[PDB]
Structure formats: structure tokens, C-alpha cells
Amino acid sequence: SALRVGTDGIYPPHSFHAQDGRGELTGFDIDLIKEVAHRLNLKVEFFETAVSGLITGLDTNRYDVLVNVAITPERQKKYDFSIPYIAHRVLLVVRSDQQDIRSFKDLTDKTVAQILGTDLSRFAKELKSHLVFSHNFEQSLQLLLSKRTDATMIPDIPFFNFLERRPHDGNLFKIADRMKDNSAVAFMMRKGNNKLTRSINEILCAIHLDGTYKKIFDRYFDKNIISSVPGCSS
């Protein structure tokens, strides 16, 4: 009788460990679901797995929520999302020196860092890019920096997180494209968790209504740069 939350804890600021990776699990999503869990009156047990096994871990019932999941028609068929609680916009980031990559269409025939088992990996593959698989967003970016790849497609959130922690690197990159729309991020439960979904929804609304959402989002993102979703009424 706890909320079994899957993550991979190497993705600041969503889900990372304090004290330079050595301490307790922390992050925007983590504090949120933990916050969610407390009001729902439930202990939380985490399970850190690699992203490539994340959804697996949910089909295979080894936990009940995933966090930081982009809403997708594909997933919306097979799963239940909570209400969106944050949004990302997907950037095509390159080295500032970069020349010929001006849109996603241009990723064909260039070398790209994407995280194996992610839609952006499947995208980069579709475009007939040359994939170099990273184990999270820090490495995706470090690979771009190390000339090992020419580009990566990464959300705004991790990528501006990176410009914070490592600010001298905030000049060594550039955004050469973003997606037309931004994308909703929601918790993801197996289909049928109808009951648990709505509770999450109610508590998220409470968390919005009483200032909590604002404290939590404020602890992690720059309000001028990352997009929140709408709040609740009453």
C-alpha cells in the first residue's frame, strides 16, 4: 500500500540524487509525486531502472507510476495519463560552431546523440541519421561537446538545467530548431488505474490551488523559460 514510482535517477532536474549523485533521490517530478503521495496518504517506493526499460517496468507490473512522460497518441491508447503537470519544448541543439543543421529535416546524414529507447532516438533513426546512443541527457550533451556527435534533440528542461549546473557551457551550444508546439508531460499509469488517476488529478489540483505547485516548480525551473500548465479553480 504505497505508490511504486519508477524512474531513472540520472536526469536533473527531473530525477537525480543529491550531493553530486551520492544522496537521496530528488527532483521536480520526484518531489511532486512524493508530494502527491503524502496527500493521497501513501508511502512511496522508488525503482531506478534505465530509461530503455522504463515502460517495460510498467507493463511488467514492477511499479505503478512513471513520471516525466510526454503525452503521445500511441501511449494514450495503452495507458492512463494524469492531467499535464508541466510542458517541455523539444530543441535541436548543436555546437555553436555548427553550420548546416538548420532544421530537423537536416539531421539526415549527420551524427546524432539520442538516448536509446526514446521517441527522440526513434525520430533521429527515422530521419536516417547516424545515431550515437547516450545513457541520459548529460551524456547526450557531453557527446555533442566532445565532437562525437553533431547534434541532439533534447527537451528545454534538461538542457537549461545543464546550462545552470555548468554555466560556462551555456555558450558552447545553440538552438537550431524547436518543435512547433510544446508537449504535455504527465504521470503514466497502466490502463485501468482509473481510480488512482483521478485522485492524482484531485491532489494535483489541490497542489496547484494552495501554492505548493509554485514552490516545487520554483525550486527547479526558471519560470520565464520553462512552461507550467494551467492551475485549478476554487
- What is the CA 82 to chain-centroid distance, rounded? 15
| 149 backbone dihedrals φ, ψ, rounded to 5° | -135, 165
Q: How far is the CB of 219 from ligand 1II (least distance, A)?
A: 16
- Within 67-220, residue ranges assigned H as helices are 73-78, 119-126, 137-145, 156-165, 194-209, 212-218
Report the DSSP pairing between strands 79-81 and 173-178.
unpaired
- Cα 173 to Cα 97: distance, rounded to the nearest angstrom: 8
- Taking the complex as a whole, the smallest distance from the CB of residue 179 to ligand 1II amounts, in Å, to 8
Region from 4-12, 23-31, 76-84, 93-101 binding its own copies, contact rule CB under 8 A: 76-84
Q: How far is the CB of 86 from its own copies (least distance, A)?
A: 8
Q: Site mask, its own copies, residues 44-73, x = CB under 8 A?
A: --------------------------xxxx
Among 56, 76, 96, 108, binds its own copies (CB under 8 A): 76
Q: Contact with its own copies (CB under 8 A): which of 57, 84, 93, 137?
A: 84
Q: Of the two residues 75 and 214, which places its CB atom closer to ligand 1II in the complex?
A: 75
Choose one: 29-37, 101-109, 144-152, 200-208; the region binding its own copies (CB under 8 A).
200-208
Give 132's strand partners. Answer: 113
Residue 4: which residues within 8 A CB-CB, separation 6 or more? Answer: 44, 45, 47, 62, 63, 64, 65
Q: What is the DSSP secondary structure assignment for residue 150, as one 8-state letter?
A: S
Binding footprint of its own copies on the chain (CB under 8 A) = 70-74, 76-77, 80-81, 83-84, 87, 90, 119, 180-185, 194, 198, 201-202, 205-206, 208-209, 211, 227, 229-234
